[PDB]
Design a protein around this ligand. Structure first.
Ligand SMILES: Cc1cc2nc3c(=O)[nH]c(=O)nc-3n(C[C@H](O)[C@H](O)[C@H](O)COP(=O)(O)OP(=O)(O)OC[C@H]3O[C@@H](n4cnc5c(N)ncnc54)[C@H](O)[C@@H]3O)c2cc1C
Ligand SMILES: Cc1cc2nc3c(=O)[nH]c(=O)nc-3n(C[C@H](O)[C@H](O)[C@H](O)COP(=O)(O)OP(=O)(O)OC[C@H]3O[C@@H](n4cnc5c(N)ncnc54)[C@H](O)[C@@H]3O)c2cc1C
Lengths: 584, 584
């Protein structure tokens, strides 16, 4: 127990006011009750609630030479136990607890999902936190408020437009169920106002939340100069430096444009799409990422002539049987695919005009991999080909923080090669680019920094869901990566089609929705992958991610009794394997 | 040992053709290839796929004295290994396997979820099976086809009407999302006509499935006379006996009418509601089971004036905090409650009138427990006050199978006190009254009987969902029983409200949907109960039932990453306890 104590000296030194406590100890309440009465921010850690809380008391007695808890540190200076605190009078203690050397305990570059979460949790454990967020506008001029990609130009509006697309099919279902429905035209502007109304309520909400936690939100861009100070330029344009013990990089990504004539001038991305003045008209999406396919999906169902232009395959990195069934379904309900094919140029012939409500005409050319060129006209070109980490122009050259393929490299505590610089969320090279990951990395990092806990974020078995017109949720390995990792002499795949009961009265096509489990027979038939394609794929999937953290096996799904009538119950009765060739 | 060695003797003797095998072995494959070309139905159990497979290969060596596989039995007669079968030749060989002391290996009284599932899996493993199902009509004369309660008058039509109710609300949601809809009136006749067409499609499906499996379906009523013969009266009244080695009671339940004037004469039950000629009009439901509230729920959203009359409490046996929000929500969107109050009488004032519509008018009065009487008029009275098991007039007095409040009592192998009589589904005293339970119990019983498997059905952690206008799913113990079982300072309750992102734009009311986990701190913070109240509650809940068979703790929900944006992710970040008194 040699350097796991020096790892804890380290967490003690870069914390703020920190109190090692126990739940039943009377002494601890008196010092904590007193810090609250003098408005002293602190963070505490309670060792009766740790399986290893025993080893913490061992380690603390080498650091301090004291045997009991409480043990209290002011930014590394050990103040002592209970009576050492009651011998500092009510104002030399308050004065001593706020000297720092730096303006801030922590500066967070980036106010996204993860920055905001790390900020809120850090302040609740005593930290003086500055949170920087500034939204460099799109080429066509789009910006948004506090909240990051998810809130403004990501999950929240995407899913909301997805739900305006679902209700169109829900409403044609409703006639089979006895309702006489008119269903008329779709008013694009009324929907984008409802959506931007929720966003602004979340802009307001995250901004309120930061003030009530005593986080200094500064609407300014961050750049690193040295490990302990950050350069900030704000709206008005003035530079100011601030000093910090800790730097967190949480800058996310922004969409990529292909290097082709007219891309930035005339195209849009997800950043622009959730705020368009006008129905996009005849649309071309470029790329076959989840963002491209989800956008084509709800745009088609809202009423647009949509065309997707795919360089090669759909959803590279996802299971490709499933990627086939998404695209086959998108394809069977109006979304046209040109593939394989890449754009070469986009020029403007006619221009958008709010003096008539008539959309620009753009013509896009392209190469078809075979050489045949492509040429057609669209009113909107939407580039959805990937996103790039915001690692340029933040000073990582000045401190020599390592990057790999644009992403900040980080250990299992989200720390870089400089021991006081961290990176969380999408700019990490850890985990999927998902906001619940960003939020968890935030909350756990906050409690290691400012309560000295050892909780680490777990990046295995992370669930995802793709909100294409028929949704696709998955956990774990694709069938092709499991077969590669473990060998086909070790993989069994159970599968089945299924027909949501909600679809039989409306006469939607059976043998479309699909469930499959990837099984590693050599490890007690462990469920190493989980895939579902059907309605409400997000809510089907979530619970099973808990069972796979517990190591669920095929035995365990079958022992579980289904809920009838649901889509999710088909996973309690999978029967048919793939090696058997029997029909699914 | 000793006791279990005879337990296997027994399933060998009451089996049909039985083959104990291993998957390594051509010697087994050659015996079974020969049975398949000689059109011999058999059931096999493969001993490599049993964790205890070693103990079978030494138990058999006590019955037979051989250690090798294959080993083959014909209804208890031990024929031997691979060369012992490669004599006999193709015709005295086929004569030995069709010799029986009875007309059937198994007769099943009841063609519901459990019976139908039990029959198919038995036939697939070698049994000569007769399946009896006959539907004695309602007071009003209504009947239905093969399939049992769930297919004809239960889960399937219930949920379809529920989905007609949801789509009405999904359609106002859609105006906030930009659609000029709008919704006209609801045609009851077109909806049940679509519903019964799917029902009929399952009637046909289950009868085809029985014929393709070579079960003799007899649309007749079953009565026991001795352990080994069943009396069958068909449509006519012609009785015929059939003899059987094993009897299964799977006769389900049917709804109870209260003992009051006019109950059977003028009211209806769930058995009638899913087939009604007419829109029910202004309706009264009596009772507060899940069946009463779900029906009350969808009738209301479809357009009816509905009223529920509760002798005491909502959803007796469920968590009653949840039962509160189920009703509080029903009540706040059009359904009227009189409670506490009980029926006394129903008489008729006007009668049907074709086809001037003029629906029957009935007058129901009652007493309010306080004594105050009740009196009013409705066009439909629906009794949802319970269901009673079909154990009268099936002959259990003749062989003396024990019952407790009408339910056939049964052990962990679903056997009664008569060793060749079993009972599955709702006539059990085992488990909740749920279709996936009937099916799983049937399906495991089939292989103890005809593969000599030892798989037992698990009645712990069964998830249920109530499809009220806002749905309610749950697993495990209610909050009130966890405190009884474990004591209140060993339970912590995490909870939170949540707002489905689909509800933000339409401005459906915040702090309505609700999630809570019941935690037993004394057993490593194990999750002993799980409750969610919200949209798509069946699909939210199902996966977590798997996680609770694996012993999920609060730690484990917290380690799991949410799928954003979903309702189910709120169980990955529950934070506020009840003992803390903070807001949810
Ligand atoms: C169209 C789209 C749909 C998506 N749908 C989902 C989904 O359904 N479910 C899911 O889980 N995830 C989804 N995601 C991904 C999710 O949005 C991201 O994973 C999440 O927002 C990342 O959080 P973050 O905090 O790491 O980065 P961000 O949220 O992007 O936060 C970065 C913030 O820092 C700002 N910033 C950048 N540089 C600086 C700088 N030098 N100084 C100061 N501020 C700076 C940025 O302007 C931004 O506000 C989607 C993404 C997109 C683009
Ligand atoms: C309105 C309603 C809604 C429900 N919703 C759900 C739900 O959403 N999810 C869920 O899991 N469960 C639900 N259930 C319960 C589910 O339907 C039952 O638990 C399931 O049907 C029981 O299956 P069973 O095979 O044991 O009996 P049954 O399905 O009832 O079938 C028994 C069959 O045997 C016939 N029979 C009776 N006596 C004889 C006799 N002497 N001889 C020959 N045949 C006989 C009967 O006519 C019947 O057809 C619901 C029930 C009702 C009433």
């Amino acid at each position: 127990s040699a350097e796991q104590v020096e790892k804890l000296r380290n967490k003690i030194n870069n914390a703020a006011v920190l109190v090692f406590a126990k739940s039943f100890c009377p002494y601890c309440k008196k010092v904590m009750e007193r810090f609250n009465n003098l408005k002293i921010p602190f963070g505490y850690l309670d060792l009766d609630l740790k399986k290893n809380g025993s080893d913490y008391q061992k380690m603390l007695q080498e650091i301090t030479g004291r045997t009991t808890v409480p043990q209290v540190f002011f930014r590394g200076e050990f103040i002592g136990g209970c009576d050492d605190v009651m011998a500092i009078d009510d104002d030399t203690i308050v004065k001593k607890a706020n000297e720092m050397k730096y303006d801030y305990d922590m500066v967070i570059i980036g106010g996204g999902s993860g920055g905001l979460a790390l900020a809120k949790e850090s302040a609740k454990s005593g930290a003086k936190v500055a949170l920087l967020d500034f939204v460099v506008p799109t080429p066509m001029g789009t910006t948004w408020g506090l909240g990051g990609t998810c809130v403004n130009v990501g999950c929240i509006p995407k899913k909301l437009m997805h739900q305006a697309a679902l209700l169109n099919h829900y409403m044609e279902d409703a006639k089979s169920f006895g309702w006489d429905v008119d269903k008329g035209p779709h008013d694009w502007v009324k929907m984008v106002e409802g959506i931007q109304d929720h966003i602004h309520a979340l802009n307001f909400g995250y901004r309120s939340s930061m003030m009530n936690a005593n986080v200094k939100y500064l609407n300014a861009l961050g750049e690193i100069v040295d490990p302990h100070t950050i350069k900030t330029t704000n709206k008005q344009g003035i530079v100011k430096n601030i000093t910090t013990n800790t730097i967190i990089v949480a800058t996310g990504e922004r969409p990529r444009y292909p290097p082709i004539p007219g891309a930035k001038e005339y195209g849009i991305t997800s950043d622009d799409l959730f705020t368009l003045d006008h129905n996009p008209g005849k649309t071309l999406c470029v790329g076959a990422s989840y963002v491209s396919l989800e956008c084509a999906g709800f745009l088609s169902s809202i009423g647009c002539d949509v065309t997707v232009m795919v360089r090669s395959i759909f959803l590279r990195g996802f299971d490709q049987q499933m990627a086939g069934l998404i695209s086959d379904y998108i394809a069977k309900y109006g979304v046209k695919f040109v593939r394989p094919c890449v754009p070469t140029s986009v020029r403007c012939l006619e221009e958008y005009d709010p003096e008539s409500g008539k959309l620009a005409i753009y013509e896009v050319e392209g190469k078809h991999e075979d050489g045949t060129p492509f040429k057609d006209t669209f009113n909107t070109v939407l580039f959805a080909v990937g996103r790039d980490p915001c690692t340029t122009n933040i000073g990582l050259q000045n401190v020599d923080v390592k990057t790999t393929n644009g992403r900040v490299v980080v250990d299992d505590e989200e720390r870089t090669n400089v021991p006081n610089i961290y990176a969380i969320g999408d700019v990490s090279n850890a985990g999927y680019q998902l906001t619940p990951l960003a939020i968890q990395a935030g909350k756990n990092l906050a409690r290691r920094l400012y309560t000295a806990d050892d909780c680490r974020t777990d990046y295995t078995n992370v669930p995802t869901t793709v909100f294409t017109p028929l949704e696709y949720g998955c956990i774990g390995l694709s069938e092709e990566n499991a077969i590669s990792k473990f060998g086909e002499d070790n993989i069994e795949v159970f599968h089945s089609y299924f027909q949501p009961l909600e679809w039989t009265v409306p006469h939607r096509p059976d043998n479309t929705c699909y469930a499959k489990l990837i099984i590693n027979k050599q490890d007690d038939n462990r469920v190493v992958g989980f895939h579902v394609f059907g309605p409400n794929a997000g809510e089907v999937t979530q619970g099973y991610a808990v069972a796979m953290h517990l190591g669920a096996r095929k035995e365990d799904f079958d022992r579980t009794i289904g809920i009838h009538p649901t889509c999710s119950e088909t996973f309690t009765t999978l029967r048919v394997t793939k090696s058997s060739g029997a029909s699914a």
